[PDB]
Design a protein around this ligand. Structure first.
Ligand SMILES: CCCCCCCCOCCOCCOCCOCCO
Ligand SMILES: CCCCCCCCOCCOCCOCCOCCO
Ligand SMILES: CCCCCCCCOCCOCCOCCOCCO
Lengths: 13, 48, 903, 333, 482, 193
């Protein structure tokens, strides 16, 4: 758990 | 004695009268070494 | 099984037997030519991802058909089968071989055959046992991160804690107000300072020891095999247990059983059965793949080193501190103790067949089977927790059920129309069915941990609504296959099948496929005797197959319940629908050449394939103005062209030695030839990739140049522009018009492996290598450990100390207040070469068991899995990925030592 | 807001397992070349430490405990006999019979007590007798006024009252479990063509017919269908009947105890094995068999309520047993 | 074999043949509206103004919007089967609402024309339902035009996009790609929907949970004010301003007890249904709240500046309801408007911080009426309503001179996301680098400069079209020059 | 091989293992005391005084106490599940409170000496909880000794029951057959508690 750190790239393939 | 003409009804069996007051009087059903219940024997094909 | 003119690669039983994982297809990495196995997590319950001859469709699945003994199965069901029961594994990667299988057999078929008892005067009893440990494979990427003192000085200088702030003020009056939080809790009030230092600026905390561990693995099985002149039996009972190497618990455990029975009744009847079952407990670490604070490998990289999760004894505490928090943060062994989770799944697969030969020639075979899974899982949120948001607990119980039936009835008539003309005719029927449901219930408001039945919750506004999910499908199929063979050297095969599925509309569901294959034995007609050459066959095939793996109800236009009040119901529109959804057609041409050599000490195979996907099933990205996310449609095309070659040898030296080798290789060139809305290219948003007509699935990002040494900004190349003689033109303003299609493919083109094997008087050594060349991945964790713009509370890489300032003006990392982009400086070269397993076994010699008749053999082996990797990827693992390396559960590294008693 | 907890059932850490001791004496004999065979067996079966939820004294702080108190004795004799009655080479006639007689007696109860009545069951456990029925006896009607009359427990001259009360019930000398059980069977086989018949009887069985509370009811539940014997009810014109006036409500006295002893033709089969000379020039089929069977064909009973057996201590709205006709094949190929 | 497998819990899309089918699809339209127009989607355009300062708790979630990070704000947000958030989520939910209102309106129009309703009361109810759907089409188009189209005081744009609107679909088909409409076409479409729907809906409010004539007047006044026409805005706000009384409280706790409860708040023109089990949600972004036993503990990702706290006098009722001094247990202020509602509680003793959606309140009708009366040259009406609103709120205004109007509108609508539109409409630049932070919160709330300067006429006040559009149809002209 | 199968869904009486179990059993003990020490139980000794006169509304219910009907008072009241009232109801509720308090006190003492409490706060609170349980034991024994044991100024008694008290039970067992303790032992037990 915890706080979510943003700026991910969404995985496709 | 089986107390219902229901297709999903199992019999009540007493060997040498009713033994206890306030307890069960059914026997111990063993099928091939390990014990079962009458609802489980209802699913076994009796030609085996 | 297959045709003579097919491309079939068989894997023996010695590649499947002693493996320390529950992922059986992971044992096949670098073993079949053209089959690319990649497992993207080291979770004990994770499963592999197979692609034979490249990816085949953009929206539908590319997984093969997995078949155990006739019935097609999922890979989570095969996860519950003991691999010491498997006799062989044959991969039919062709169009003349996958002609009697038809659900998604355009993608290849993996056929697994179980052992049957070789009949003799005495049956054989074997007893295997094994134990081993499992670790993390790469602890190198955290040798570059900052320490505690450097991180606090970097944060103080970078203005994160405020203007005009000394390292001592932040160190004392800011961060060591962890006394105020710990003083409010009765269990930590009198423990702060004595045996609990949650903020420590002298030493540095070890977060790899807090977040990962060394796990055990054990297995064992007893197996009897026998048979008389007519009948034969193979029975096996076993046990497997694998623990996960992270502190967030994940485990796989199963107790299996198998009875294969086969009997010749009389001179026209032969019956048989393959009964199997298991009791399995799964649990998966279900926070990996995302970014949280102190979770995963992101947590070992980015937690500040002046935060201590330990005691003064060196053991792990129950909580830790992070500044600004309002409650303590639970560690992993304590969060796994206040949130329990159990799963128990009962599995039974019963197959059976009856084979009848009335006259000489034809052979009527009937086969039927059922697979039944009953899963029952439970989870809690324990009450009376001091470090929670509420003192009340919850409990959720789910019950899953899957049932799959199949029937297959064939009739084959084989005859000889002359002396030297052989024919064979086969026709058949196949019906596959599935239904499954999940029911679920929940309860909240418990106050004691013994009164936590689901009927004992609060009964007001604490009630909730249950869960229920139903799915089903069905396939009907007819087929026929004819074979013809000339004199012994020319073979032709023809095949026609008809396939219908429930996943398509009522007037679009049926399709017709065909196959033509041919083999020519050049050695037995043309050069019938030679001194060095020993066999030479030339095979050639063209076929058409179909793919239908998309999901059950995707052509209907639907409407669901969206309630507004608690009085009446409401109806919203769910999907758009597609009334003319149909199959996806794939045509494949294959041309192969198999050759032998010096009394079959050397052998080779060369295959060339072209594969074409027409009317492909794309989950097309509907634009946002429609109000739907996506829609499955029959638009687009694709093509895969390639070559794969194999060669086996024997290089041995003396009377006792026996040295051999093998190798594989496969190059595969993808090409998209038609997209969906009349488009020439489509860029997938926030993936970093593109689909463009004429090129494979490539990457799509701007090209990072460097920094401007006079200003300190980040610079990117403006695409397709060169100034006077000089170099290319750069710019320091990031625009979306700077993005270029890179000539770097998402799916890796080159795939292979090799192997070495030596032996002696009993002692043997084996080594298998598997390599992937042409792989690239976006490292997402280097967005978080390599930026001075944002997320300044995390631990950073050591290069950010040597940053650009007006004083320090000959660096190469940028100025501080700048966010990084997802450009070419985050694409890492994730190609690898891995030593898969290194086995050293020693068969005990036959002289010791001379007079004792109760033990007839013994065998001891040592084994090490995943112990070497050659990479340039700086990210804990190159294989865990698929265009983006997120917070990943890296692959394990096992050391296993077992015994086998064949008594 | 907060949960509290308190002890509620009290247990006992000395729960035993209802002990039993059984003594047995048997004699088996076989007559002329083992044709006639007989077997007789005598048994005494004693049970101690039975499990009852006994009402506790007031120092317990609870109402009951579930402890092991009590005793019981079952004394009986059972015998069986087989026989074969040939008259020819082909013919085979055989017969069999069983019998079991069992007498139950309660020996001792809990806390010095001599007699205990389970609430809301309708039975009574008295020392010296089996567990019997517990109801008020029914004398009849009084043909001077047409009202129902129940006997008084004791008060022998007996004396009857016309006003029902719960202080009028007594122990009825009719046991709950039936004492005599048996069954016999015939059989005959000419050549292949066999005929078997099995009979099974239980005598000594009493049963409360609960539907006769409704179908012969003078006052109340008037919207239902009634019995034909309510058409000659007691008026002042017709006053030589034994059915009461139409303004009274019946009770659960011993005019609802029916005698549910029966004798049931439990099975009757006609088998014909097909002869061996028919499967002569063949090796596929080995043999065959055909049969016709009837189950629960015939029943001899003085009960009035669709089934004597379906029930057990009371007959409510019941599912009667079935009468079945079955035809069957068997191809032993 | 029949191979027909049909889903469970799902029926087929059919034309309307009954009156209960029209009622069911109307209730579905309102339950879809509740998950679109809720305060969670208007937090992005609230943080982007010059009132917030990110704390050290921030995990780069709110930091693109506060510090104006145009490298992230170009392609921002998700809309798929996992998550719906961001600019792309804001675009998707209002396009979904517009399309589903189109399907409902066209199906009930065809059912009215085919004469499938029995009585005359069913015809009257079906016509009222049709007007209630026309209002929701107007709201969806206006809220897309609000964020994805330029105000007329803009300097540099992508060439050809200064007088463009959004893609305008007026009938339900999901297979349509096309170019952008102009601003005049979209505004005549919005105002035609509203003026056709006022003439059918009845005079008095049927229920607070459904669209009335009061809400159509309030929405039309809001659109006319944000358009720039003050006479029609005052004329529309005058018809609804005197039917809804303000909250009559004597201290801050009475104002907290009447304001926070949806069922007893006497000045709500339109709100969504919410229970403890159906219709409630937590909006804990601006305050960062978390329950702990029986009380609440806050860990905010962004806190207001000092000039925002200094707008409220010390005896104001909104200085303990709208913003509260609860950061670091007593040290600083946060925006505490969407805290909780005590009716939507599992156990009455323990908080769960669940609120419901409110669509319009009468304290914005007052501000629209005062601003329009001040701009059209009418001084007694502006005082007549500004003194009333500010005296009912706790501290009365002395002089009314459009500095008090700007201050009172900034004080009254905080958290609702109306400040960016106001500072565009009032020619107010950013000046985020010039403001000071709260002095009691140092170490927690510190100075971060903007990553992009935003003067008057900057392109980045309006958002860029999400990158599923501009990829699926290339006849869409984008907004920004970069 | 241990073959204990504890019932899931309820607790049972045993020595404690946590502080929350102790606190919850204490709250249940107080909720039990609320129905024992009631005004409705002490009305029968109020009506047996010389300050009441029954009226015509009576149904011979409040009449055996005001008129001193020594044939009804010899076995009065019932304590089955339908109704707990009368002299037998008095005896039942006070012996019930005495047994539950015995169970709570002995379980808390065993949990205190078995060292199952983590910090010092829970140990201090559990010692105060034990003291409260001892006060409730003394209240139960005194309220039984008040009505069922003779005062010293009594003329004619049963032969042997002059200096006897109530059945002094110190542990928890519902099935208990014992003799009456003497009056001195009961008063020393109360005062030592
Ligand atoms: C003619 C085929 C009849 C088969 C029906 C039997 C189905 C029962 O099997 C249920 C599944 O359980 C699997 C049994 O596990 C194998 C245990 O045997 C190993 C012991 O040697
Ligand atoms: C539905 C029920 C089907 O369950 C089949 C599971 O049978 C269990 C197989 O037995 C396991 C044998 O291995 C145990 C030895 O360790
Ligand atoms: C509703 C239940 C209908 O399902 C019937 C299941 O019977 C299907 C038989 O499956 C084949 C089993 O036979 C294979 C022998 O091992």
């Amino acid at each position: 758990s915890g706080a979510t750190t943003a700026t991910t790239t969404t995985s496709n393939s | 004695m089986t107390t219902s003409g229901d297709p999903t009804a199992v019999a009540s069996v007493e060997i040498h009268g009713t033994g206890s007051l306030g307890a069960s009087s059914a026997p111990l059903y063993i099928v091939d070494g390990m014990q079962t219940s009458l609802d489980v024997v209802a699913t076994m094909n009796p030609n085996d | 099984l297959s045709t003579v003119s097919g491309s079939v690669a068989k894997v023996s039983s010695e590649k499947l037997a002693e493996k320390p994982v529950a992922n059986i297809m992971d044992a096949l990495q670098g073993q079949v030519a053209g089959m690319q196995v990649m497992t993207t997590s080291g979770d004990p319950t994770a499963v592999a991802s197979v692609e034979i001859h490249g990816t085949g469709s953009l929206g539908a699945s590319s997984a093969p058909l997995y078949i155990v003994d006739g019935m097609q199965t999922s890979l989570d069901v095969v996860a519950t089968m003991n691999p010491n029961d498997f006799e062989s594994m044959s991969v039919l990667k062709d169009a003349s071989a996958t002609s009697i299988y038809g659900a998604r057999a355009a993608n290849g078929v993996v056929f697994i055959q179980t052992k049957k008892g070789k009949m003799s005067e005495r049956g054989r009893i074997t007893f295997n046992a094994s134990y081993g440990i499992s670790q993390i494979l790469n602890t190198k990427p955290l040798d570059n991160m900052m320490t505690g003192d450097e991180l606090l000085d970097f944060q103080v200088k970078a203005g994160f804690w405020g203007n005009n702030q000394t390292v001592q003020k932040v160190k004392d009056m800011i961060l060591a107000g962890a006394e105020d939080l710990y003083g409010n809790y009765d269990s930590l009030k009198d423990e702060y300072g004595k045996t609990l230092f949650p903020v420590d600026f002298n030493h540095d905390a070890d977060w790899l020891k807090a977040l990962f561990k060394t796990a055990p693995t054990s297995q064992g099985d007893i197996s009897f095999s026998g048979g008389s002149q007519g009948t034969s039996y193979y029975a096996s009972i076993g046990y497997f247990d694998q623990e996960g190497m992270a502190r967030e618990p994940a485990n796989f455990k199963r107790y299996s059983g198998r009875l294969n029975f086969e009997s010749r009744i009389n001179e026209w009847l032969k019956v048989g059965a393959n009964l199997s079952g298991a009791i399995a407990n799964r649990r998966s670490a279900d926070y990996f793949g995302k970014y949280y604070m102190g979770s995963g490998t992101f947590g070992v990289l980015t937690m500040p080193r002046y935060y201590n999760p330990f005691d003064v004894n060196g053991d792990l505490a129950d909580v830790y501190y992070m500044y600004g928090a309002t409650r303590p943060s639970m560690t992993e062994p304590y969060f796994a103790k206040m949130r329990p989770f159990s799963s128990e799944s009962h599995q039974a697969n019963v197959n059976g067949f009856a084979q009848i030969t009335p006259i000489k020639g034809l052979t009527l075979k009937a086969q039927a089977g059922v697979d039944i899974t009953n899963t029952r899982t439970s989870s809690k949120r324990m009450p009376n927790n001091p470090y929670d948001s509420t003192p009340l607990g919850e409990r959720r119980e789910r019950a899953y059920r899957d049932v799959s039936k199949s029937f297959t009835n064939t009739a084959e008539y084989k005859f000889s129309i002359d002396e030297k003309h052989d024919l064979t005719a086969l026709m058949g029927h196949e019906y596959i069915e599935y239904e499954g449901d999940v029911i679920g219930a929940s309860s909240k408001g418990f106050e004691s941990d013994k009164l936590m039945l689901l009927s004992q919750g609060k009964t007001g506004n604490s009630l909730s609504l249950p869960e229920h999910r139903v799915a089903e499908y069905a396939y009907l199929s007819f087929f026929s296959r004819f074979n013809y063979g000339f004199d012994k050297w020319m073979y032709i095969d023809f095949s026609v099948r008809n396939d219908q599925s429930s996943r398509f509309g009522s007037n679009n569901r049926s399709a017709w496929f065909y196959s033509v294959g041919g083999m020519f034995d050049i050695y037995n007609k043309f050069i019938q005797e030679s001194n060095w050459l020993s066999d030479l066959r030339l095979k050639m095939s063209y076929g058409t197959t179909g793919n239908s793996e998309i999901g059950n109800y995707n052509h209907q236009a639907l409407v669901t319940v969206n309630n507004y009040t608690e009085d009446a119901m409401g109806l919203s529109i769910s999907t758009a629908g597609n009334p003319d959804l149909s199959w996806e057609k794939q045509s494949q041409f294959n041309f192969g050449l198999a050759a032998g050599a010096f009394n079959n000490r050397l052998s080779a195979e060369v295959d060339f394939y072209v594969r074409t996907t027409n009317d492909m099933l794309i989950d097309v990205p509907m634009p946002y103005i429609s109000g739907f996310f996506s829609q499955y449609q029959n638009v687009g095309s694709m093509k895969n062209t390639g070559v794969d070659l194999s060669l086996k040898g024997t290089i041995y030296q003396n009377k006792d030695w026996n040295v051999y080798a093998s190798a594989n290789f496969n190059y595969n060139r993808q090409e998209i030839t038609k997209l969906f809305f009349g488009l020439n290219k489509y860029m997938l948003p926030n993936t970093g990739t593109i689909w463009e007509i004429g090129y494979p699935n490539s990457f799509y990002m701007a090209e990072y140049a460097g920094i401007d040494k006079k200003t300190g900004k980040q610079l990117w190349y403006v695409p397709g522009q060169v100034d006077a003689d000089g170099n290319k033109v750069t710019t320091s303003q990031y625009s979306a018009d700077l993005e270029t299609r890179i000539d770097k493919s998402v799916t890796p083109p080159i795939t292979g492996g090799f192997s070495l094997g030596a032996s002696w008087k009993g002692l043997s050594l084996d080594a298998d290598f598997a390599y992937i060349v042409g792989k690239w991945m976006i490292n997402n964790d280097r967005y978080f450990t390599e930026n001075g713009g944002g997320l300044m509370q995390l631990n950073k890489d050591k290069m950010l100390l040597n940053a650009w300032t007006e004083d320090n003006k000959e660096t190469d990392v940028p100025k501080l207040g700048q966010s990084p982009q997802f450009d070419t400086h985050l694409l890492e070269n994730a190609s690898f070469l891995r030593l898969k397993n290194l086995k050293l076994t020693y068969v005990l010699p036959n002289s010791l068991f001379a007079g004792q008749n109760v033990i007839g053999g013994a065998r001891v082996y040592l084994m090490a899995r995943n112990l070497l990797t050659v990479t340039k990827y700086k990210g804990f693992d190159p294989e865990a990925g698929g265009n983006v390396g997120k917070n990943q559960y890296p692959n394990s590294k096992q050391y296993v030592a077992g015994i086998q008693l064949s008594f | 807001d907060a949960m509290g907890l308190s002890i509620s059932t009290a247990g006992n850490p000395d729960l035993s397992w209802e002990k039993q001791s059984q003594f047995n004496f048997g004699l088996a004999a076989g007559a002329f070349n083992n044709r006639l065979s007989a077997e007789v067996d005598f048994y005494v079966r004693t049970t101690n430490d039975m499990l009852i939820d006994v009402p506790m004294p007031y120092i317990s702080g609870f109402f009951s405990q579930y402890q092991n108190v009590g005793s019981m004795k079952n004394t009986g004799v059972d015998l069986s006999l087989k026989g074969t009655i040939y008259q020819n080479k082909d013919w085979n006639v055989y017969a069999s019979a069983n019998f079991n007689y069992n007498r139950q007696e309660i020996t001792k109860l809990f806390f010095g007590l001599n007699k205990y009545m389970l609430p809301n069951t309708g039975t009574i456990w008295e020392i010296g007798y089996p567990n019997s029925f517990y109801m008020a006896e029914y004398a009849g009607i009084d043909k001077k006024t047409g009202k129902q009359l129940w006997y008084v427990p004791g008060q022998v001259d007996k004396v009857t009252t016309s006003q029902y009360s719960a202080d009028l019930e007594t122990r009825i000398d009719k046991s709950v479990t039936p004492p005599i059980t048996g069954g016999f069977s015939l059989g005959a086989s000419w050549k292949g063509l066999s005929l078997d018949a099995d009979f099974a009887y239980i005598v000594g069985k009493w049963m409360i017919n609960n539907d006769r509370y409704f179908t012969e009811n003078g006052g109340g539940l008037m919207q239902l269908n009634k019995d034909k014997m309510l058409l000659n009810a007691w008026t002042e014109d017709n006053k030589e009947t034994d059915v009461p006036k139409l303004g009274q409500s019946p009770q659960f006295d011993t005019h609802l105890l029916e005698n549910a002893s029966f004798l049931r033709l439990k099975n009757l089969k006609l088998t014909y094995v097909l002869p061996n000379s028919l499967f002569a020039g063949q090796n596929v089929i080995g043999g065959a068999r055909v049969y016709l069977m009837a189950r629960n064909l015939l029943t001899v009973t003085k009960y009035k309520g669709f089934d004597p057996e379906a029930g057990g201590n009371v007959g409510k709205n019941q599912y009667p047993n079935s009468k079945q006709y079955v035809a069957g094949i068997q191809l032993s190929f | 074999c029949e191979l027909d497998r049909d889903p469970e819990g799902k029926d087929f899309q059919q034309p309307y043949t009954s009156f209960v089918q029209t009622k069911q699809n109307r209730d579905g339209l309102y339950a879809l509206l509740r998950n679109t127009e809720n305060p969670r989607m208007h937090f992005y355009q609230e943080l982007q103004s010059d009132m917030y300062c990110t704390t050290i708790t921030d995990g780069n979630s709110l930091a693109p919007f506060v510090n104006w990070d145009l490298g992230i704000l170009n392609d921002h947000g998700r809309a798929d089967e996992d998550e719906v958030s961001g600019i792309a989520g804001y675009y998707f939910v209002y396009n979904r609402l517009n399309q589903q209102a189109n399907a409902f309106v066209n199906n009930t129009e065809a059912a009215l024309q085919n004469q499938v309703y029995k009585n005359s009361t069913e015809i009257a109810n079906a016509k009222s339902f049709l007007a209630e759907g026309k209002v929701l089409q107007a709201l969806a188009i206006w809220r897309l035009m609000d964020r994805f189209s330029f105000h007329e005081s803009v300097t540099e744009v992508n060439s050809g996009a200064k007088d463009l609107g959004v893609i305008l679909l007026k009938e339900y088909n999901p297979g349509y790609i096309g170019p952008r409409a102009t601003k005049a076409q979209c505004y005549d479409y919005i105002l035609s929907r509203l003026s056709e729907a006022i003439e059918v809906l009845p005079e008095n409010r049927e229920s607070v949970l459904y669209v009335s004539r009061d809400y159509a007047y309030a929405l039309r006044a809001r659109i006319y004010l944000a358009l720039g026409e003050y006479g029609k805005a005052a004329a529309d706000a005058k018809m609804v301003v005197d039917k809804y009384p303000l909250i009559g409280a004597a201290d801050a706790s009475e104002f907290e007890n009447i304001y926070r409860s949806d069922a007893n708040n006497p000045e709500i023109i339109f709100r969504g249904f919410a229970s403890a089990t159906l219709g409630s949600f937590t909006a804990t972004t601006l305050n960062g709240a978390a329950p702990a036993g029986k009380d609440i503990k806050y860990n905010p990702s962004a806190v207001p500046f000092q000039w925002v706290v200094d707008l409220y006098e010390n005896e104001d009722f909104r200085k303990s309801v709208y913003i509260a001094k609860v950061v670091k247990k007593d040290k600083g202020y946060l925006v505490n408007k969407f805290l909780e509602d005590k009716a939507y509680r599992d156990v009455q003793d323990k908080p769960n911080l669940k609120v419901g959606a409110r669509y319009f309140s009468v304290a914005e009708v007052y501000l629209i009426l005062v601003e329009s009366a001040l701009q059209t040259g009418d001084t007694p009406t502006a005082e007549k309503y500004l003194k009333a609103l500010s005296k009912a709120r706790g501290a009365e205004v002395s002089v009314v001179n459009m500095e008090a109007l700007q201050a009172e509108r900034t004080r009254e609508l905080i958290g609702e996301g109306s400040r960016l539109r106001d500072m565009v409409r009032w020619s107010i630049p950013n000046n985020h680098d010039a403001f000071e932070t709260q002095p009691g919160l140092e170490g927690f709330a510190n100075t971060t400069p903007l990553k992009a300067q935003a003067p008057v006429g900057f392109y980045a006040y309006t958002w860029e079209f999400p990158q599923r559009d501009r990829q699926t149809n290339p006849q869409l002209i984008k907004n920004w020059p970069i």
